[PDB]
Design a protein around this motif. Sequence first.
Motif, short mmCIF file in Angstrom:
data_model
loop_
_atom_site.label_atom_id
_atom_site.label_comp_id
_atom_site.label_asym_id
_atom_site.label_seq_id
_atom_site.Cartn_x
_atom_site.Cartn_y
_atom_site.Cartn_z
N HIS A 1 0.86 -1.18 0.00
CA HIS A 1 0.00 0.00 0.00
C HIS A 1 0.89 1.23 0.00
O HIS A 1 1.91 1.28 0.73
N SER A 2 0.52 2.23 -0.79
CA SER A 2 1.27 3.47 -0.87
C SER A 2 1.34 4.16 0.50
O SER A 2 0.43 3.94 1.32
N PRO A 3 2.36 5.02 0.78
CA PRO A 3 2.41 5.72 2.08
C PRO A 3 1.19 6.57 2.43
O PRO A 3 1.03 6.88 3.61
N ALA A 4 0.33 6.96 1.43
CA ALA A 4 -0.87 7.75 1.73
C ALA A 4 -1.92 6.96 2.54
O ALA A 4 -2.81 7.55 3.14
N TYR A 5 -1.80 5.62 2.56
CA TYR A 5 -2.70 4.75 3.29
C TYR A 5 -2.30 4.70 4.76
O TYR A 5 -1.12 4.47 5.07
N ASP B 1 3.13 9.46 -4.82
CA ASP B 1 3.39 9.76 -3.41
C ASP B 1 3.37 11.27 -3.19
O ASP B 1 2.72 11.72 -2.24
N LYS C 1 0.02 12.40 -2.79
CA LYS C 1 -0.66 11.72 -1.65
C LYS C 1 -1.74 10.74 -2.14
O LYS C 1 -2.85 10.71 -1.63
N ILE C 2 -1.39 9.95 -3.16
CA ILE C 2 -2.33 9.02 -3.76
C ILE C 2 -2.33 7.69 -3.05
O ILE C 2 -1.26 7.14 -2.72
N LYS C 3 -3.56 7.16 -2.84
CA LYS C 3 -3.78 5.82 -2.32
C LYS C 3 -3.77 4.88 -3.51
O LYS C 3 -4.63 5.00 -4.39
#
Lengths: 141, 147
Positions: free
Chosen positions: A22-26, B11, B14-16
């Motif tokens: 999962h990307s760091p935004a999660y 990133d 700020k993308i999920k």
Amino acid sequence: MPVKKLKQFLDSHKIKYLSIAHSPAYTAQEIAASAHVSGKQLAKTVIIKMDGRLAMVVLPASDHITSDLELATESEFEGKFAECDVGAMPPFGNLYGLPVLVSTKLSAQDNILFNAGSHSELMQLSFGDFEKLVKPTLVTL
Amino acid sequence: MPVKKLKQFLDSHKIKYLSIAHSPAYTAQEIAVSGKQLAKTVIIKMDGRLAMVVLPASDHITFMKLKEAIGTSDLELATESEFEGKFAECDVGAMPPFGNLYGLPVLVSTKLSAQDNILFNAGSHSELMQLSFGDFEKLVKPTLVTL
């Protein structure tokens, strides 16, 4: 590193497993919520001391846990693996000589999904493959 | 590397997004993600200019359909050496649909805009990336086309 060791272990056994990053935004909460919404059970590992000996209890992340039973301190096991975040220990206790106790809530599912080194990195493999490799004792919790 | 560049881009915004990597014990057949519409990127030349066409992996581009969508007859598929071959670590056919990062216009099939997520190969056929179609459309600003 437990994760690199785990992947090397599973590859040597020709296991079909997925790594979900999962990307760091999660956030960790968004990850647990996504797994739940998807109809998946995210499994977590807790280190216990059973009659003074280190063991792993594997159960749903949303659930909580002989009479000689106590939770282990981080320095007793988890702290020894610095690259692996606390609470993100894969349930492969066999690789460290720890008996593994698995919730029957997890054995009911086709797959086992768990944190691998951090809250963002997940790993999934069939419960059948996990059960054959680890040989856990199934427990009702 | 297109993948590292894409992750750095997403990133910063700020993308999920998810990255799904299949262990080497997986065959291509067991990898082949049914129900969820896997998207593939095809490199074309529009009026001599490199562009990306993003459509379902089960779908194919035809000249008549691109001509009707773009309005030009100067259409051809690009050679690997023209674009894909320039990114050696990224497998042919596993190019992410983020043409904006390379100055390529992006054309997206209307069949993909109907789904909540966009799922595509990222660097290889065993590694997939998923993010919401809304995030993808906002970031890439593609032209939506009927194919």
